[PDB]
Design a protein around this ligand. Structure first.
Ligand SMILES: COC(=O)c1ccc(O)cc1
Ligand SMILES: [Cl-]
Ligand SMILES: [Cl-]
Length: 163
């Protein structure tokens, strides 16, 4: 575990993380996909061997000795708000289990279901709060990765609000 487990946010490509493992915002079929998933495919393509896994689950595949945790959030274009919310919460619970099993001291995580799976809605708070619910009981340093300046500011304020 980390000496003083913390949350941090960085605005940069998760493919250039400085943590002991990465969470992919995966699709259920293990395809190269778009956005975070395509950056992860370019950096760790070996990790996509038998990476397909259902919505609301996480499946870890090694790239060398570096673990890629493929976490499948719901596409809110297909799910109802209610069922989507349940699957998004479930995906993060499975990420916490994998991070624990791996024994890593740090993990790089994107906000699941906030990009092309958002159903055209701002889901920063919804996704971040499900991340906190899952990861609060783990002792890994969590570093949250985002793209846009507005998002960095709001994620930083939410982290600072609980301290
Ligand atoms: C924080 O999100 C990313 O790391 C990311 C990487 C590549 C993309 O094309 C989009 C997002
Ligand atoms: Cl970058
Ligand atoms: Cl997404």
């Amino acid at each position: 575990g980390a000496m003083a487990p913390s949350y941090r946010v960085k605005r940069m490509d998760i493919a250039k993380n400085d943590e002991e493992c990465v969470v992919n915002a995966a699709n259920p079929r293990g395809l190269p996909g778009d956005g975070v998933c395509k950056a992860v495919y370019k950096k760790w393509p070996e990790s996509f061997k038998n990476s397909a896994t259902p919505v609301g689950t996480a499946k870890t595949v090694m790239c060398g000795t570096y673990p890629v945790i493929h976490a499948v959030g719901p596409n809110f274009s297909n799910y109802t708000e209610s069922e989507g919310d349940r699957e998004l919460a479930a995906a993060y619970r499975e990420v916490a289990k994998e991070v624990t099993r791996l024994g890593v001291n740090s993990v790089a995580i994107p906000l699941l279901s906030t990009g092309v799976y958002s159903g055209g809605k701002d889901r920063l708070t919804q996704s971040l709060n499900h991340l906190f619910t899952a990861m609060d009981s783990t002792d890994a340093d969590v570093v949250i990765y985002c793209r846009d300046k507005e998002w960095e500011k709001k994620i930083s304020e939410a982290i600072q609000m609980r301290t």
